[PDB]
Ligand binder design. Structure first.
Ligand SMILES: Nc1ncnc2c1ncn2[C@@H]1O[C@H](COP(=O)(O)OP(=O)(O)O)[C@@H](O)[C@H]1O
Ligand SMILES: [Mg+2]
Length: 911
């Protein structure tokens, strides 16, 4: 209907310390907020910082608020006031958080103060009905879709960590929950620094016809000072200050040492100088645990503290069974804890990881080694954060930690009250340019950008609800609320087109354009002559050492340089090391950049792929070996220079047809045209005319301005992900889930219940009788495959009791890939059937028999924690599958799956 968002942000004057703006519908006029009609919903012992006061007042005026501030500032102060007005006026409230662990402590942190609280997480329902219900975002989405009544009395939904909407996988759940939520509800959003905070406000203003205020402060309660440890270095160096200033001088020095037990010295130093507590963030479970055993050589705890650790560990581990209290981890973790040394990793049994968390808060662990995700976990802030590496593997390739990652993990430094200041240390193992360090340490926080991925649970559930259609979510989605730039695209199109018209009177007649095409086509034909020269059959025999070759990147010309070697590394791609002039700055780089016109620059060895060589020259010149010294590298410049002085036209070049090699391929045809175009040029009347250089330059601007105008017009159709819904709707109709008129069918309504896993395969397998005629023990293992997505494991040999079911899951999985392909979906059959992993299948059947976890832990190499996560996720899948069978009324299946939940739910898991 071509109806687009019409929302205006109006600035609200702010006392020093906050930026307050108010997103409002354009039609609605701005009225200043009313003040404190009620004396106080809640009273805080602490003296409120200015941002807290402006945000709370918005809660008071029943106007929605979005808060962005650093992780030690009092963002929660805003959540607790909202919960207080809600409990006071009796309106029900919900707190929704990204991870379950934030919720389990937050239920308790909220329960003590309020005591009319409930927890809704898949693992547990406590006080299922209460005025304040802590719901994970995932259960809210289920509840909103299920037509549950808990959302009837809610007028405040508190979305903590809305900056977790960015992730592709769970970003749909937050965006979906906000759209499904009624326009009546007012929402308080708690986020860390986000550059695009205003846009989020405009979404909740357009989406819910209300004002979403935005409060932004850069306040950090405890100043953080950033440090870097060069390898093999006596001391730490101050790269960044409390004032935030970047010290390049020290950073290059710290770097300078880098050109030419390490953790133990840094940890020991921190402890001696009272920089404790230190969270050492290692990127691997193998590195973190192994590092701790290094510090076992030192005792960091008092004798009184050791008794307190023993009293806490045993009170905590009393819950476990006597055979269970002797598991290989339980015995081993206590000694490390006594010394003040702790491990926080996802390979940990859950009861132990919570004990480590309670002790660190209580001060009984003074050096905690943690994997990154402890960062996502609530609180547990420290004085010093130490990074055992500056690079984290992305699976496809190893990469430096993103600016955003340093900002989260560095913010666990600076306890607000105990520490006057906070200290952050990075250990760098590879050369880094100042440009990388300025971004990693001083990086602006990542923008909050949508990752709306359509899921069959999204399409199927929306078909069930009568009022809404799957397409509704697409239009109200954050991804289609970037409609805010279409109006900008139009402003450039008209403005640029008017500019072309002012240029058109200045531009000359089409006769110059005719030359431009002949000049441009000859350049285009020229690139084709180069494509043949780069070919590894002809170029490589000729890329001998000492040769004069010219290297050009995209938009960068390095110019003449002398080859040092010929080699194959990384259709194979061949790498030639060509000495090329490069900026004196490129010496610092770990990406080498061509010398600027200002400086002569310094020659250096830049690995160059053969594909980048513009030209190969028939002049080979001497390269001194030991090209390390600045004098030897610069000497070649004088030698390449004499070749340029001796020859006026330029260095001679080897003709591909004769000197370079056998051009059996018809380059003669590209060359045949090249000469004629040169003949067409020059013969063209406008050749070498007086003031031609300026006369021709204008012609280029008009062409490129047209390119800019033409290109922008292509990007201005809408309907961005409709092809995916269209293809996804077709797979559902074919498989049997929905009718051709888009009405859900009973096969479909079962899949709406299985939202913890692949709804399509499990509902289709359920129909083909796969689950039927299988012992509950066999069924529990097969459903595990859906909820295990790890790696670096070898399948335990599977007997026909467990392999035969697996061979049959694949057949349904192969069909779903095939129906998906004929539906123009992007599924690759191999990944889909491999997505479900059979690695932990024999560790779930053995658990079903009644074997203790220790037998189970031995059967597979997986860390104890991967087994616990798979098992509670399996208990839910079983719970979702048993409800699904109610719809089809299969009595055995509902009981068989319910039998499975009882057999699996035992001992240390589900503690
Ligand atoms: N006025 C205040 N200034 C600074 N810190 C405060 C203040 N009041 C409470 N705090 C402390 O700061 C934290 C409150 O903010 P927090 O819950 O960390 O927000 P978020 O988790 O959203 O970053 C808690 O440690 C709290 O005890
Ligand atoms: Mg928090």
């Amino acid at each position: 209907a071509d109806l687009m968002p019409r929302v205006k942000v109006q600035s609200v004057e702010t006392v020093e310390g906050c930026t307050h703006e108010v997103a409002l519908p354009a039609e609605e006029d701005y009225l200043p907020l009313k003040p404190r009609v009620g004396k106080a919903a809640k009273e805080y012992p602490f003296i409120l910082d200015a941002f807290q006061r402006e945000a709370i007042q918005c809660v008071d005026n029943n106007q929605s608020v979005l808060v962005s501030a650093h992780t030690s500032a009092g963002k929660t102060v805003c959540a607790e006031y909202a919960i207080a007005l809600a409990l006071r006026e009796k309106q029900r409230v919900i707190f929704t958080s990204p991870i379950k662990a934030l919720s389990n402590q937050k239920y308790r942190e909220m329960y003590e103060e309020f005591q009319d609280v409930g927890l809704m997480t898949g693992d547990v329902t406590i006080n299922p009905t209460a005025s304040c219900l802590v719901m994970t975002t995932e259960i809210l989405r289920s509840m909103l879709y299920r037509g549950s009544e808990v959302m009837r009395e809610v007028a405040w939904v508190i979305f903590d960590e809305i900056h977790y909407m960015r992730d592709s996988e769970r970003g749909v759940v937050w965006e979906e929950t906000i759209i499904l939520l009624p326009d009546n509800v007012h929402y308080v959003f708690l986020s860390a620094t986000i550059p695009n905070a205003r846009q989020f406000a405009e979404w909740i203003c357009h989406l819910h016809k209300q004002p979403c205020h935005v409060i932004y402060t850069d306040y950090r309660p405890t100043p953080l000072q950033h440090y870097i440890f060069p390898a093999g270095g006596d001391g730490l160096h101050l790269v960044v200050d409390e004032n935030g200033d970047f010290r390049e001088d020290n950073f290059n020095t710290a770097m300078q040492v880098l050109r030419d037990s390490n953790v133990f010295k840094i940890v020991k130093m921190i402890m001696e100088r009272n920089f404790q507590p230190v969270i050492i963030f290692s990127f691997s479970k193998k590195d973190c645990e192994a590092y701790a055993l290094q510090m076992t050589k030192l005792d960091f705890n008092t004798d009184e503290e050791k008794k307190m650790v023993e009293e806490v560990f045993s009170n905590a581990i009393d819950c476990l069974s006597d055979e269970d209290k002797k598991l290989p981890q339980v015995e081993h973790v206590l000694p490390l804890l006594k010394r003040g040394i702790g491990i926080h990793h996802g390979g940990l049994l859950p009861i132990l990881k919570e004990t480590i968390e309670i002790l660190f808060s209580e001060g009984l662990i003074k050096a905690l080694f943690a994997t990154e995700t402890f960062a996502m976990g609530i609180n547990m802030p420290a004085r010093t954060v130490l990074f055992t590496n500056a690079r984290k593997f992305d699976g496809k390739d190893f990469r430096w930690i993103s600016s955003g990652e340093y900002i989260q993990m560095s913010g666990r430094a600076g306890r607000r009250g105990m520490d006057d200041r906070g200290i952050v240390i990075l250990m760098v193992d590879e050369k880094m340019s100042p440009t990388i360090g300025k971004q990693l340490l001083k990086g602006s926080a990542d923008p909050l950008n949508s990752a709306f991925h359509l899921t069959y649970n999204m399409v199927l559930n929306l078909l069930r609800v009568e009022e809404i259609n799957p397409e509704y979510m697409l239009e109200k989605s954050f991804y289609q609320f970037q409609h805010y730039r279409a109006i900008p695209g139009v402003v450039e199109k008209v403005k640029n087109s008017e500019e072309q018209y002012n240029k058109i009177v200045i531009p000359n007649e089409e006769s110059v354009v005719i030359y431009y095409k002949i000049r441009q086509q000859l350049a285009k034909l020229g690139k084709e002559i180069e494509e043949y020269i780069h070919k590894p059959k002809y170029c490589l025999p000729f890329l001998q050492p000492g040769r004069l070759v010219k290297v050009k990147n995209e938009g960068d010309d390095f110019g003449w340089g002398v080859v040092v070697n010929f080699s194959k590394k990384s259709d194979p791609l061949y790498v030639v090391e060509v000495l090329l002039r490069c900026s004196k700055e490129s010496l610092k780089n770990s990406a080498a950049k061509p010398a600027k016109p200002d400086e002569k620059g310094e020659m250096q060895v830049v690995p160059v792929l053969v594909h980048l060589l513009s030209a190969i020259s028939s002049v080979r010149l001497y390269i001194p070996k030991d090209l390390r010294p600045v004098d030897n590298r610069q000497s070649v410049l004088k030698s390449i220079q004499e070749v340029q002085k001796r020859f006026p036209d330029g260095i001679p070049l080897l003709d591909p047809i004769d000197d370079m090699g056998i051009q059996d391929q018809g380059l003669k045809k590209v060359i045949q045209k090249v000469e004629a175009f040169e003949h067409r040029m020059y013969s063209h009347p406008l050749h070498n005319d007086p003031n031609l250089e300026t006369v021709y330059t204008l012609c280029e601007k008009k062409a490129q301005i047209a390119i800019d105008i033409k290109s922008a017009k292509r990007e201005l159709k809408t309907v961005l992900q409709m092809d995916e819904l269209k293809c996804r709707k077709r797979v559902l109709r074919r498989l049997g889930f929905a009718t051709s008129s888009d009405v859900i069918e009973m096969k479909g309504r079962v899949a709406c219940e299985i939202s913890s896993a692949d709804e399509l395969l499990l509902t289709e397998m359920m129909f083909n009788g796969l689950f039927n005629d299988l012992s509950a023990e066999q069924a529990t293992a097969l459903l595990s495959c859906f909820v295990f997505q790890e790696n670096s494991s070898e399948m335990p040999k599977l007997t026909e009791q467990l392999a035969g079911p697996l061979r049959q899951m694949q057949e349904c999985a192969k069909r779903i890939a095939k129906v998906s392909a004929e539906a123009k979906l992007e599924i690759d059959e191999e990944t889909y059937l491999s997505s479900f992993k059979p690695h932990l299948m024999d560790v779930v059947y053995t658990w079903a028999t009644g074997a203790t976890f220790a037998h189970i832990c031995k059967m597979t190499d997986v860390f104890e924690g991967s087994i616990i996560r798979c098992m509670r996720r399996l208990e839910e899948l079983l719970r979702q599958m048993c409800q699904a069978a109610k719809a089809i009324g299969n009595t055995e299946l509902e009981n068989k799956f319910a039998e499975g939940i009882t057999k699996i739910k035992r001992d240390i898991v589900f503690a």
